[PDB]
């Protein structure tokens, strides 16, 4: 159940790869524009 | 004199004369590419 120190180096980088496989490198730019089109514009109107 | 152009979507060799709006008669694409010239260009393998 517990991740041993020898297997940690493989687990941490595995978790990181999942992050970049879902969010990406420019997720902060896409999410910003997305929320702007879905909510901000409709709210401004 | 013919000035045959190429398309970006259909890759059809269509003739286009001057004073003619750019539009592919085969697919209507508005971007045209020119064909490789016939001149003899030399390339030294260095």
């Amino acid at each position: 159940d517990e991740i041993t120190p020898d297997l940690w180096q493989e687990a941490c980088w595995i978790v990181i790869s999942s992050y970049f496989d879902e969010k990406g490198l420019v997720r902060q730019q896409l999410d910003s524009f997305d929320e702007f089109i879905q909510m901000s514009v409709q709210r401004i109107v | 004199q013919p000035m045959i152009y190429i398309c970006g979507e259909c890759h059809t060799e269509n003739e286009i004369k001057s004073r003619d709006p750019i539009r592919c008669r085969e697919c209507g694409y508005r971007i045209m590419y020119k064909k490789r010239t016939k001149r003899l260009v030399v390339f030294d393998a260095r």
Binding site: - | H11, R36, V41, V42, F43, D44, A45, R46
Partner: protein, 260 residues
């Protein structure tokens, strides 16, 4: 005040590399011979390309420069050909060049690997190494369905100083004094260094004792050829080339002495 009486002892000879040993000669003669193997050994290689059609993802200069690096069998033909500078012909001829041709088009859906096997030459003696009748064929460029590559190349005679494509060697392992007897090097911790393949010493020892009256002798060599010239032909063509430069230099010298 005279020359040496050098000897030779070959320990390995193959179609790719040749390992020999030169004794009773000066370090300069051994080094210059090493430099000639790379920079003063004539060889045939592509030096002129005319792309008639190229729809591949690689521009012309990428292909032309790539064709030059393709080794061509030049064992007995390079000696017969002449340099374009000395030839009294036009831009090209059969005596100063070897015409090549390439015509490939990817009609199928699978990627077509344009290799050196497609380079059709007019002279059957001068052909790509991999095409010489294991080793695979050189990869020039990959083509997609609908792409085409058609050109007309010409090979010439040249040596390394003009371009690396005219280098018939793939590595020249020049070594002398495996055991550091002359102390040309100074190992701060000789025990931490490995033993050379030509070393003659017990594992308990690190380096041979100092020899004050010692001189660089017994130079080892390993001429790994690219494939164009046989490992043995490179040496013979090298010594003949180095002997020709000195012969011509001697002529120009006498031409200056008698003029003074």
């Amino acid at each position: 005040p005279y020359a040496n009486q050098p000897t030779v002892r070959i320990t390995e000879l193959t179609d790719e590399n040749v390992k020999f040993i030169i004794e009773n000669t000066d370090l300069a003669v051994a080094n210059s011979i090493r430099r000639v193997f790379i920079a003063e050994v004539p060889i045939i290689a592509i030096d002129w390309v005319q792309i008639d059609a190229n729809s591949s993802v690689l521009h012309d200069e990428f292909i032309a420069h790539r064709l030059g690096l393709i080794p061509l069998t030049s064992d007995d033909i390079v000696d017969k050909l002449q340099y374009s500078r000395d030839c009294t012909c036009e831009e090209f001829c059969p005596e100063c060049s070897v015409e090549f041709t390439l015509d490939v088009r990817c009609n199928e859906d699978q990627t077509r690997h344009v290799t050196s096997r497609d380079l059709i030459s007019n002279s059957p003696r001068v052909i790509p190494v991999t095409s010489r009748n294991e080793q695979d064929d050189i990869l020039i460029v990959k083509l997609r369905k609908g792409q085409e590559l058609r050109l007309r190349a010409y090979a010439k005679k040249g040596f390394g100083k003009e371009h690396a494509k005219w280098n018939p060697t793939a590595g020249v392992a020049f070594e002398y004094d495996p055991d550091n007897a002359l102390r040309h090097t100074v190992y701060p911790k000789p025990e931490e260094w490995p033993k050379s393949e030509y070393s003659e010493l017990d594992e308990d020892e690190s380096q041979a004792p100092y020899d004050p009256n010692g001189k660089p002798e017994r130079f080892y060599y390993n001429v790994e050829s690219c494939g164009s010239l046989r490992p043995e032909t490179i040496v013979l063509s090298a010594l003949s080339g180095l002997k020709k430069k000195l012969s011509d230099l001697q002529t120009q010298l006498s031409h200056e002495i008698q003029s003074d």
